[PDB]
């Protein structure tokens, strides 16, 4: 209740991938002190390092950041992170689930997320985001919403996108359970992503026997472009790096929906600076 | 402090009873023990999965956690532990064990020696901990009574 | 001698490639009647058919044009073209030649252009264009300009982009042997080219590892071989193909300054925008 | 179409003089005679190279060209910028013959892409005659005294000693 200018965000973000929380940031208006980011595969770094002008402090592997890291390179005012899902979806077989291969990733966050916050008794702002699928075991889910002593908010982006993306969101950040604005950006169909000359069979994109788009008189798959579209990436936004189109597409399947971190976000601009 | 007192115990230990048997071997007062399990006033409250951090907040003020097994325990174990840490600023006596069997796979180890920011005694079984004499560089009761020892400088003694 | 309204191009464009010559002629301001293009390769049919979004008739193979149909699809006010050079390269050391292998291809144009050619007493404006690399068999060359009945003029892109490209370049447009303008849209440095935190160890690309970024050495980008070559960035990003083929069909295209420097003097003789 | 005139031929045949050989053999008057090779009143010119559009127009007119010899593209493709320039512009309905044989041993694409150029498919004898000669006007397909019957309609076309 006193006041103060507001002031640039800084941002810990675990897990960081082609820095859509930057990306997000930086659409909001929102001024960004820093931007620390822990990431290992290296196409992403490069994606982040390039279209954000080496902005991003990278840091590398998670297990690599102690609680003394977290003290020297903050304070941090948001805490971000998406781990790994291979271990927690259903889909896999082979899933080792949340407390062992890659799904124990998810305690890293649990880690340095209590290294992260405030000491008791400072009131300062202080926000973070957990995201995962929903197609996990119920017992995982249970788990990870004792361990953040949170319940996890159902987002899907074909609310306000052309995909399929039904997503757990933990966090909290102000009003994630509100409902979604659908503005005039939002591409809701599939055909209003792809490139001239092309139809799309269906309304919106799955993660088979379907090639989702048809060109002259050929069947064809979804192109890298009309998958950043889909997801609401700027167009060319992975062209970088010199990588396969089955790299880029690996990179963009296991991003975030730019517009459904939009909408997580914006409350944020009642607390920071903004442009 | 002002005086020794006794000591406030919280087990996710496999073994409800294991710490408190060692305690009362080494003549020390215990003034709470609360056991859990992992599953799938002294008290056994259940499920681990059932204890919050409320739980940990009204039973406490804790002074030792000990946990394992002779893993994802381990996790479980963290998160009682933290739930039991003193606030930064409090520099009363906290202490904490963790066991598992040297049998492990050596990124189990390394993450839990991470975690921990502790090296583990290597006796065959692996401990963690925090107490005097368990610092180290880069049934099984007795041997838990040993590396107990320091607490009977820190804690009544009847 | 006589007036008349300046009325938009019609160009005949044999083995197209990604299309650099309807984006050179708009680049220009010059409009463009029609466009039709004869190309095999299927990547570079969808780079032309995304980034003009329709407006370019695709025929096929250069070799199932027929006299009657260039009469049919014409007139046409320019044709150009670049013919395969894997066969003419003295680089290559199983090439067949002019006459043999994808070399003869070139004949393909010698004919289709005396079809499109204005019979005699018609003295419309005809231009045309034929390149190919100055890295070919000296009969070869000797060869192309006694079937063209012209010289071809030596255009190295180096002099208005980053890249070392020499070509030959045989034709009636007005002007090819004047000067050629270094303007500011010109990036003649490698490290113009490149993306952000890169360093470049050359000035002018020779398509080793030409690029350093961070602490390890690196190869060129798509994006900045696009800005090497003159395109427009991520032009050729469509129809998911791999890095190796997006390098295969920028290193058969056109420099677009160089076509630009050719093509520019032809908005004295149609419409413009 | 006045009246007969005699022939005059363009010959880039590999054999010099064969044409005019089988011209006399039909009894053919000649008025004139061009030779020439592909190497690597009646004249031999030499080199093919040699021999621009404008010395065909100059030695021209010509009613009759011959090539071709008893890589295949080469004397092909140098035959076939003769044949072009040689030809009478549109609108001039004079009448103008060629032929053109090369042995049957030769690639398909080879055959496909003769065929194709001169818009007329093979007449098999073994060797291939391309030719608009009345007669060697042929369907899709699934030593002089050759060139002798190919050549006899000429006889009712230009004047005869
Ligand atoms: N040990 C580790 N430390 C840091 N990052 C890791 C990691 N193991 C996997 N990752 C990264 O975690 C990411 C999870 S996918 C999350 C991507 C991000 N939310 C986006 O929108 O782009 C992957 O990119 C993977 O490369
Ligand atoms: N038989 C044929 N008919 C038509 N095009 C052909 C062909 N054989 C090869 N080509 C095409 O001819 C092109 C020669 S490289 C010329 C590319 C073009 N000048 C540009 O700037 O992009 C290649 O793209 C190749 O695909």
Same mark, same amino acid.
């Given at each position: 209740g006193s006041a103060e200018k507001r002031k640039p965000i800084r941002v810990l973000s675990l897990?960081?991938?082609?820095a859509t929380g930057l990306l997000v940031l930086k659409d909001l208006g929102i001024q960004v002190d820093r931007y620390i980011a822990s990431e290992v595969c290296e196409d992403s770094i490069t994606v982040g390092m390039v279209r954000h002008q080496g902005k991003i402090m990278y840091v590398g592997?998670?297990?690599?950041?102690?609680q003394k890291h977290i003290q020297e390179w903050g304070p941090f005012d948001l805490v971000i992170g998406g781990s790994p899902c291979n271990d927690l979806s259903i889909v896999n077989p082979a899933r080792k689930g949340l407390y062992e291969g890659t799904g124990r990733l998810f305690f890293e966050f649990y880690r340095l997320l209590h290294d992260a916050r405030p000491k008791e008794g400072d009131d300062r702002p202080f926000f973070w985001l957990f995201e995962n699928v929903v197609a996990m075991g119920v017992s995982d889910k249970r788990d990870i919403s004792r361990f953040l002593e949170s319940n996890p908010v159902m987002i899907d982006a074909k609310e306000v996108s052309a995909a399929h993306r039904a997503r757990y969101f933990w966090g909290n950040?102000?009003? &994630?359970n509100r409902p979604l604005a659908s503005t005039v950006?939002?591409?809701?169909?599939?055909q209003e992503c792809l490139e001239h000359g092309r139809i799309a069979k269906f309304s919106k994109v799955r993660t088979d026997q379907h090639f989702p788009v048809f060109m002259n008189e050929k069947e064809d798959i979804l192109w890298c472009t009309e998958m950043e579209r889909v997801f609401g990436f700027?167009?060319?936004?992975?062209?970088?790096?010199? &990588?396969?189109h089955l790299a880029r597409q690996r990179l963009l399947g296991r991003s975030w929906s730019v517009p459904v971190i939009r909408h997580l976000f914006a409350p944020l601009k009642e607390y920071f600076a903004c442009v």
């Open positions: 897990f960081d991938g082609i592997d998670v297990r690599s950041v102690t950040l102000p009003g &994630m950006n939002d591409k809701l169909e599939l700027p167009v060319h936004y992975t062209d970088v790096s010199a &990588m396969s």
